[PDB]
Structure 1
Amino acid sequence: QLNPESADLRALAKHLYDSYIKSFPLTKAKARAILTGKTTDKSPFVIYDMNSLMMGEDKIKFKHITPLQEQSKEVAIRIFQGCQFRSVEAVQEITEYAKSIPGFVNLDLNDQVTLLKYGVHEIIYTMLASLMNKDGVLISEGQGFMTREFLKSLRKPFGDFMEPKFEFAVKFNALELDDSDLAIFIAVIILSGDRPGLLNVKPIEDIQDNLLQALELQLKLNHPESSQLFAKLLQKMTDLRQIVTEHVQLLQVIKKTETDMSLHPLLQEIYKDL
């Protein structure tokens, strides 16, 4: 028996899911379909070693997930550049989703920037989980699949970047959330009134309160038998924070060890004084 209040919350949930589908080309629904089973070109090419990687570049439409060179001795840096490029693209998608969140574009512009600066990576890790399973991660719009073991065997620094994400993913995936759930959750993440440097926290907390309300209802309707999923999901927010912290440290190592590499401008600004 939908009430007048719960009615508006359902409308918000629908709106967000709609914008999510429109803003993110590769949904968890598609990722799962690729990862589990089918025959259509949905089957990804699997990269689990140097030779398969070499053939991957030939098979997979890596149209652009590689800078201007390839014979860069180590594949470690080629993967680095590719992952970097995808993140920038993800920031772009998340930024577009954000503008669809009711009230977000009406907030002070400096705060819009602050909210995006701190929320984008937490969102990136949340959604990256949709593309992972305990054995690897979908890449190049789902065309390829790079194994966890392969990524772990990379040169000293690089071989330590992905594991923490996989550990978070296997755990987060156990909540069995679908795209309709995630659309609201990522909205909640963005409208965080506790981000450093925010000018007007009040209007932001008001928007988040309504999102939380929407998320609460969504999880109870969509996952009836999942006791306290709402609270379990909210607690996952601490895991995302840690991933970021740790990630930043690994980045500082790369910056010093690899003088010939550099973070993309967008990413640099995001991490500056974080």
Structure 2
Amino acid sequence: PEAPYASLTEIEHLVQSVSKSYRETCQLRLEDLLRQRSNIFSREEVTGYQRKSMWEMWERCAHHLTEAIQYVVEFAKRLSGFMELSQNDQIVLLKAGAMEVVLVRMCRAYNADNRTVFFEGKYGGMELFRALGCSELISSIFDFSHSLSALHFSEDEIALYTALVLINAHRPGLQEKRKVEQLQYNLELAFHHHLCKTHRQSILAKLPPKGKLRSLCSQHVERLQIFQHLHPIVVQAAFPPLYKELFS
């Protein structure tokens, strides 16, 4: 809801609702990603990935990213007020924000102890993705996940943070900007309430600087678009109007 004078009841139900939506749209539970940290690709398995073609690695990565986006879109549609927005406004928020949320969620699958990430059943370093020839971009994604891992987000914290990545009234092309401002205001009030209540306000000053996530997402999506133009993946679109905006 967008209503003014959001009560303590509304705010705490917004926290619970967003956290449930987050937990139920994760590909794997946090406890399963943590329990798989000891399951690491052997040097033989890493060499097998490195000897794959650029196009086979592109297909594997693109497949995972398509699924990650689709989960974020499920998450967005569960956020209160989102499905009451116009289709234009839903697509404006997702086109910018969906990959930004995917990039934030990646930190759950990042192990800062040995700089590995979960990929197709085991953990491996960035040398696993050598065949793609995107060493600088993948290095920036690892760095960003490392910076987010240092915050030690609770499930509530990462849920509210990613809800605010999506429900942002400053995306160009919104026709109901005032309505999204009111939704965002209430999410910010919930986020700040929750952080104050749990004595975790110290994380606010440590969140990624204004524009860093947007910039990383821009570099990432630019690269994905170039790969798609040169070797298009065939996606069965779960959300055809959104798909048309990104793949046309």
Do both proteins adopt the same fold according to a TM-score greater than 0.5, normalized to the shorter chain? yes
Tell me the residue number matched to 1:229.
203
Contact kept, 8 Å, 1:114 with 1:195, in 2: the verdict is yes
Per the alignment, residue 11 of structure 1 pairs with 13
Superposed CA offset, 1:21-58 (max 9, x none): 222231334323332xxxxxxx52x3365x314778xx
Quickly say closer, same or farther: Cα 1:263–1:244, change in 2 above 3 A. Answer: farther
Q: Which amino acid aligns with 1:120?
A: A
- Match of residue 33 from structure 2: 31
Distance 1:242 1:111, change over 3 A: same
CA deviation after TM superposition for structure 1 residue 73, in Å: 6.5
- Give the secondary-structure state (helix, strand or coil) at the position aligned to 1:240: helix
Specify the SS of the correspondent of 1:195.
coil
Question: Does 2:45 correspond to 1:52?
Answer: yes
State how far apart, in whole Å, the 2-side matches of 1:156 and 1:89 are: 19
Candidates 154, 161, 166, aligned match of 2:137: 161
Matched, 1:130 2:108: yes
Change in Cα spacing, 1:33 to 1:74, as seen in structure 2 (3 Å) is closer
Is the CA contact (8 Å cut-off) linking 2:53 and 2:131 kept in structure 1? no
1:271 shift after superposition:
4.2
Judge conservation of contact 2:137–2:219 (CA < 8 Å) in 1: no
Quick one: structure 1 residues 87 and 251, their matched pair in 2 at CA, closer, same or farther if it must change by over 3 Å?
Answer: closer
Q: Give the number of aligned pairs.
A: 236
Residue type of the partner of 2:27? P
- Which residue in 2 is equivalent to 1:81? 59
The aligned counterpart of 1:91 is 69
Q: Deviations over 1:217-266 (max 9, x none)?
A: 222233x1x45423433x4452211211222443466468xx4x125556
Q: Which residue of 1 aligns with 2:119?
A: 139
Deviates more, 1:162-171 or 1:246-255: 246-255
Partner Cα separation in structure 2 for residue 15 and residue 183 of structure 1: 10
Give distance in 2, aligned partners of 1:156 and 1:80: 7
Q: Is the 8 A contact 1:103 1:207 kept in 2?
A: yes
Q: Which residue of structure 1 aligns with residue 232 of structure 2?
A: 262
Structure 1 runs (4+) deviating above 6 angstroms are none
Structure 2 equivalent of residue 240 of structure 1: 213
Cα gap change, 1:252 to 1:17, in 2 (>3 Å):
closer
Q: Which residue is equivalent to 1:201?
A: 177
**Match for residue 149 of structure 1 among 111, 127, 139:** 127
Deviation at 1:10, TM superposition (A): 1.4
The correspondence for 1:22, drawn from 24, 35, 47, is 24
- Whether the aligned pair in 1 keeps the contact of 2:110 and 2:116 (CA below 8 Å) is yes
Q: 1:196 to 1:264 in 2, by over 3 A?
A: farther
Unaligned runs of 5+ in 1: 36-42, 57-71
TM-score w.r.t. length of structure 2: 0.82
Equivalent AA in structure 1 for residue 117 of structure 2:
V
Per-residue CA distance 1:142-201 (angstroms, 9 max, x = gap): x211212333xx247333331111000111111111211111111111111111211110
State the identity %.
22
Q: CA RMSD in A?
A: 2.9
Quickly say closer, same or farther: Cα 1:79–1:146, change in 2 above 3 A.
farther
**Unpaired runs of at least 5, structure 2:** 1-5
Q: Quote the residue 1:183 is aligned against.
A: 159
Q: Which has the higher contact order (CA 8 A, sep 6+)?
A: 2
Q: 1:138 aligns to what SS in structure 2? A: strand
Displacement, 1:76? 3.5
**Alpha-carbon separation, structure 1, partners of 2:99 and 2:81:** 21
CA spacing shift, 1:217–1:75, aligned 2, 3 Å: farther
Counterpart in 2 of 1:216?
Answer: 192
Structure 2 CA distance for aligned equivalents of residues 116 and 147 of structure 1: 30
- Structure 1 residues 270, 123: closer, same or farther in 2, change over 3 A? farther
TM-score (norm 1): 0.75
